[PDB]
Amino acid sequence: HPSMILGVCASIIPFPDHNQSPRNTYQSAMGKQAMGVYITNFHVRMDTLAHVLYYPQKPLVTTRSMEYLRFRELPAGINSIVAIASYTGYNQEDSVIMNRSAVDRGFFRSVFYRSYKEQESKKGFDQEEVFEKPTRETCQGMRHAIYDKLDDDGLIAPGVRVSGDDVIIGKTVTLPRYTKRDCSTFLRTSETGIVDQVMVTLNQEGYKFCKIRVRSVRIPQIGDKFASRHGQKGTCGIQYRQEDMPFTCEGITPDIIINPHAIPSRMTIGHLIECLQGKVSANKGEIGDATPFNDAVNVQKISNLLSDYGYHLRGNEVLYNGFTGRKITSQIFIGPTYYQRLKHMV
Amino acid sequence: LNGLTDRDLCELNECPLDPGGYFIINGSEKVLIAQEKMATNTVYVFAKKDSKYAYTGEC
């Protein structure tokens, strides 16, 4: 099959021969930054950086090479209702307007896991790092933090909520009335979250060694980076609620609004065909086939299939203004497009 | 994990969808990137960049 010349990350692109080639390259770069479920046993692993989406979805418009990439078993992204419109001017210059009500309903919400490792080493008789809860008069150099989060072992427990000025591991090293000095570790500055797991073991040298996983729930913000599967990356410009978004005659508001000016210079026509095929697949119940070199699938066939479901054949719909209720004069191209939340949060 | 079924991999808290192909060095997963090179034992004739040699063989 001639579509077997593509790699792993370029085989998830729907209709990649309808895009300009640098945008296929850019999506292949950004398919590795897309957040989904990276592996199934993510609860055991103490990965130093992990991102898990709450509700990853398989694409409505897939390629036949995606069956062997196991993308429908570990997906990275959500099928958004994307309307390509100029609404309020907050999606200009590669920017995205998301639905605040959708985001409240769990749209693209994720968790981010940090892991902190610490060894209870013994460097001779004089230097002896010990996992213990530091005491204000015994320990020198205590960082004016809340050390009451820790337990009697010097380690925090899972479930305790923490921030950048909080200690998670209490480690004190003997000083050769200050019998020891505090060499504890804290969270990174501007980080936050809740301690998810605390694991204690022995390392190769036989000393006590702990790994603490802290989760932080990442709700999609203004400035978070979202990319379609066609090299159309952009940050969230603003979030409007469901009553502020434009709506169809049946009340469907877009989850994402992107600018019409992101298409013509980039020539990502496969994005538009993916929206059309996603509309047909959602109204039909099928999963759209977007294998690159397929003569059984062209734009006119998808248009006739869409017109069979009581829609305009080119994917346009009459949207009404969310603010005033008036019909928008230009009918808006709206449909399901597979979007990806990238790791580059603000 | 060689030849183990999905249930046996899940008993070991291992992902059946994990393809392997990496090493665990000090608890860190290391992947070996395939380094490409000129093929050995083959005669290649090039034209050097305006040096004292107009053409050069190489094996």
Partner: peptide, 29 residues
């Protein structure tokens, strides 16, 4: 006899599947 063109598109993606059942994706490692 041979594979008809109308039966071809579902046939090739069968044999490709038989590849990835056997080799997988990290076979070269």
């Amino acid at each position: 006899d041979e594979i008809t063109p109308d039966l071809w598109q579902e046939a090739c993606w069968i044999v490709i599947s038989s590849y990835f059942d056997e080799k997988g994706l990290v076979r070269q490692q």
